Design an enzyme around this catalytic site. Structure first.
Site, PDB file in Angstrom:
ATOM      1  N   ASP A   1      -1.814   5.048  -5.376  1.00  0.00           N
ATOM      2  CA  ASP A   1      -2.100   4.560  -4.219  1.00  0.00           C
ATOM      3  C   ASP A   1      -2.373   3.616  -4.933  1.00  0.00           C
ATOM      4  O   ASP A   1      -3.706   2.499  -5.716  1.00  0.00           O
ATOM      5  CB  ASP A   1      -3.377   5.560  -3.839  1.00  0.00           C
ATOM      6  CG  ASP A   1      -3.766   4.204  -2.277  1.00  0.00           C
ATOM      7  OD1 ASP A   1      -2.789   3.130  -2.220  1.00  0.00           O
ATOM      8  OD2 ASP A   1      -4.530   4.775  -1.510  1.00  0.00           O
TER       9      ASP A   1
ATOM     10  N   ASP B   1       0.830  -1.148   0.018  1.00  0.00           N
ATOM     11  CA  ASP B   1       0.212  -0.148   0.053  1.00  0.00           C
ATOM     12  C   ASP B   1       0.721   1.378  -0.020  1.00  0.00           C
ATOM     13  O   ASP B   1       0.932   2.047   1.601  1.00  0.00           O
ATOM     14  CB  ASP B   1      -1.143  -0.241   0.778  1.00  0.00           C
ATOM     15  CG  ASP B   1      -1.911   1.140   1.472  1.00  0.00           C
ATOM     16  OD1 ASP B   1      -1.934   2.258  -0.038  1.00  0.00           O
ATOM     17  OD2 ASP B   1      -2.463   0.585   2.634  1.00  0.00           O
TER      18      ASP B   1
HETATM   19  N1  LIG Z   1      -4.228   2.844   0.276  1.00  0.00           N
HETATM   20  C1  LIG Z   1      -5.261   2.549   1.587  1.00  0.00           C
HETATM   21  N2  LIG Z   1      -5.768   1.754   2.079  1.00  0.00           N
HETATM   22  C2  LIG Z   1      -6.628   1.827   2.854  1.00  0.00           C
HETATM   23  C3  LIG Z   1      -6.346   1.748   4.928  1.00  0.00           C
HETATM   24  C4  LIG Z   1      -6.846   2.180   5.184  1.00  0.00           C
HETATM   25  C5  LIG Z   1      -6.660   2.327   6.809  1.00  0.00           C
HETATM   26  N3  LIG Z   1      -5.369   1.856   7.032  1.00  0.00           N
HETATM   27  C6  LIG Z   1      -4.295   1.558   6.671  1.00  0.00           C
HETATM   28  C7  LIG Z   1      -2.884   1.060   7.543  1.00  0.00           C
HETATM   29  F1  LIG Z   1      -3.310  -0.067   8.262  1.00  0.00           F
HETATM   30  F2  LIG Z   1      -2.210   0.303   6.472  1.00  0.00           F
HETATM   31  F3  LIG Z   1      -2.571   1.562   7.990  1.00  0.00           F
HETATM   32  C8  LIG Z   1      -4.494   1.262   5.075  1.00  0.00           C
HETATM   33  C9  LIG Z   1      -7.020   0.121   3.051  1.00  0.00           C
HETATM   34  C10 LIG Z   1      -7.710  -0.560   4.000  1.00  0.00           C
HETATM   35  C11 LIG Z   1      -7.921  -2.082   3.670  1.00  0.00           C
HETATM   36  C12 LIG Z   1      -8.277  -2.687   2.551  1.00  0.00           C
HETATM   37  F4  LIG Z   1      -8.549  -3.455   2.260  1.00  0.00           F
HETATM   38  C13 LIG Z   1      -7.352  -1.481   1.219  1.00  0.00           C
HETATM   39  C14 LIG Z   1      -7.261  -2.520  -0.349  1.00  0.00           C
HETATM   40  C15 LIG Z   1      -7.302  -1.826  -0.351  1.00  0.00           C
HETATM   41  N4  LIG Z   1      -6.937  -2.399  -2.213  1.00  0.00           N
HETATM   42  C16 LIG Z   1      -8.216  -3.122  -2.730  1.00  0.00           C
HETATM   43  N5  LIG Z   1      -9.544  -3.022  -1.928  1.00  0.00           N
HETATM   44  C17 LIG Z   1      -9.383  -3.057  -0.426  1.00  0.00           C
HETATM   45  C18 LIG Z   1      -7.130  -0.092   1.490  1.00  0.00           C
HETATM   46  C19 LIG Z   1      -7.086   2.721   2.445  1.00  0.00           C
HETATM   47  C20 LIG Z   1      -9.065   2.417   3.058  1.00  0.00           C
HETATM   48  C21 LIG Z   1      -9.612   3.896   2.024  1.00  0.00           C
HETATM   49  C22 LIG Z   1      -8.951   4.676   1.117  1.00  0.00           C
HETATM   50  C23 LIG Z   1      -7.826   4.511   0.734  1.00  0.00           C
HETATM   51  F5  LIG Z   1      -7.214   4.811   0.719  1.00  0.00           F
HETATM   52  C24 LIG Z   1      -6.495   2.989   1.460  1.00  0.00           C
END
Ligand SMILES: NC1=N[C@](c2ccnc(C(F)(F)F)c2)(c2ccc(F)c(-c3cncnc3)c2)c2cccc(F)c21
Ligand code: NA
EC number: 3.4.23.46
Length: 375
Positions: free
Chosen positions: A219, A36
């Site tokens: 992203d 991520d």
């Molecule tokens: N870019 C991002 N990473 C988050 C995110 C939000 C908050 N904290 C985090 C952490 F834990 F990594 F810090 C990540 C995330 C969390 C859980 C997921 F399942 C996914 C995801 C990724 N790809 C496809 N489907 C779902 C993304 C996320 C949530 C919402 C908007 C975003 F831009 C993101």
């Protein structure tokens, strides 16, 4: 631990991100971790959950150190909460190193884990500025760089699933043509500047600041290309005009419903190409990355709908700026050159094309009539 041994180290499920195998603790506990570039925390499931195949068991790790600090992360679409600590971390199909890194052990969550995604945590590759609870929690990549001789760069080749994460370098077998660089505007998210948007060669004719309202980021943790309301509305109007030989429900354009065609009959040619022009490393110079419908119409695999090929429109409205997500990154080799505060793009070996069109990374382009495109 050479770049060759790092090739094909990513796997994924469409719309559910791309993950790398990692180990945490001593003795090592194997986990699949979503890569991520949109976050800066290394956060892993550390308690049972219906959607978790396995989880981090701190009690089994002698190298675990408790930081005696909780972390609570509510976000637009869900939430996660946990406890901070540090432990030994390695990437088996990554650099041949073991580092001590911060780890947020997720003990409670809401709509964070996904059923059958095959990943148990997330590796936030962005900068300390956006780390939770605050910027004092050193992100994983920063620790990897400080503790080893690994160069301060990584690249992602996301293939529409599998791909590669190359740490500490650029693997030339993953792309063709030239690498074009756009500056990292600020080290928080991987923030960039979009200077022009075209849909089938037609300029959207908006002040370029609109494209970056209130920021534009790269992203890998977002599936869609997300656009600010004004830009999203103009893009949809232009895509509808190009594809007007077929009329789709409003819900399709909102991402609320699928569009289906008899297997193998998807009319790719009625859908236009989207060009995003990114700010170059020199004044009023830019390059473009071109997205085909094979990237922005995301296939939804479902055995029940399998007499057909069904897709979700993977472009959506944002109120938090542009997000160049996975559908944009797919078929480009994306170099996160932290050392030189720049992001490189090149056509990937797993790029998208049919016999008429191919995704591209092209330049240079000149615009003498330019203002600053940033907010
Ligand atoms: N870019 C991002 N990473 C988050 C995110 C939000 C908050 N904290 C985090 C952490 F834990 F990594 F810090 C990540 C995330 C969390 C859980 C997921 F399942 C996914 C995801 C990724 N790809 C496809 N489907 C779902 C993304 C996320 C949530 C919402 C908007 C975003 F831009 C993101
Ligand atoms: Na895709």
């Amino acid at each position: 631990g050479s770049f060759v041994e790092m090739v094909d180290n990513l796997r994924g499920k469409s719309g559910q991100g791309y993950y790398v195998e990692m180990t945490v603790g001593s003795p090592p506990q194997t986990l699949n971790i979503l890569v991520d570039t949109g976050s800066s925390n290394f956060a892993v499931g550390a308690a049972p959950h219906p959607f978790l195949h396995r989880y981090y068991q701190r009690q089994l790790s002698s190298t675990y150190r408790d930081l005696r600090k909780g972390v609570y992360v509510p976000y637009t679409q869900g939430k996660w909460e946990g406890e901070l600590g540090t432990d030994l971390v390695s990437i088996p199909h990554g650099p041949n190193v073991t580092v001590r890194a911060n780890i947020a052990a997720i003990t409670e969550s809401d709509k964070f884990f996904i059923n059958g995604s095959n990943w148990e945590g997330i590796l936030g590759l962005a900068y300390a500025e956006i780390a939770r609870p605050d910027d004092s929690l050193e992100p994983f990549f920063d620790s990897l760089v400080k503790q080893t001789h690994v160069p301060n760069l990584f690249s992602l080749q996301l293939c529409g699933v599998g791909g590669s994460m190359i740490i500490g370098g650029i693997d030339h077998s993953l792309y063709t043509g030239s690498l074009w660089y756009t500056p990292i505007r600020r080290e928080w998210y991987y923030e960039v500047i979009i200077v022009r948007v075209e849909i089938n060669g037609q300029d959207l004719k908006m002040d370029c600041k609109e494209y970056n309202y209130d920021k534009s980021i790269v992203d890998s943790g977002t599936t869609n290309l997300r656009l600010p309301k004004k830009v999203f509305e103009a893009a949809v109007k232009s895509i509808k005009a190009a594809s007007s030989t077929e009329k789709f429900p409003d819900g399709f354009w909102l991402g609320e419903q699928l569009v289906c065609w008899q297997a193998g009959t998807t009319p790719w040619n009625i859908f236009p190409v989207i060009s995003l022009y990114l700010m170059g490393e020199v004044t009023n110079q830019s390059f473009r990355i071109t997205i085909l419908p094979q990237q922005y119409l995301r296939p939804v695999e479902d055995v029940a709908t399998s007499q057909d090929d069904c897709y979700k429109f993977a472009i959506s409205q944002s109120s938090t700026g542009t997000v160049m997500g996975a559908v944009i990154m797919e078929g480009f080799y994306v170099v996160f050159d932290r050392a030189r505060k720049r992001i490189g793009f090149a056509v990937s070996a797993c790029h998208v094309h049919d016999e008429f069109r191919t995704a591209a990374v092209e330049g240079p382009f000149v615009t003498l009539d330019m203002e600053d495109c940033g907010y």
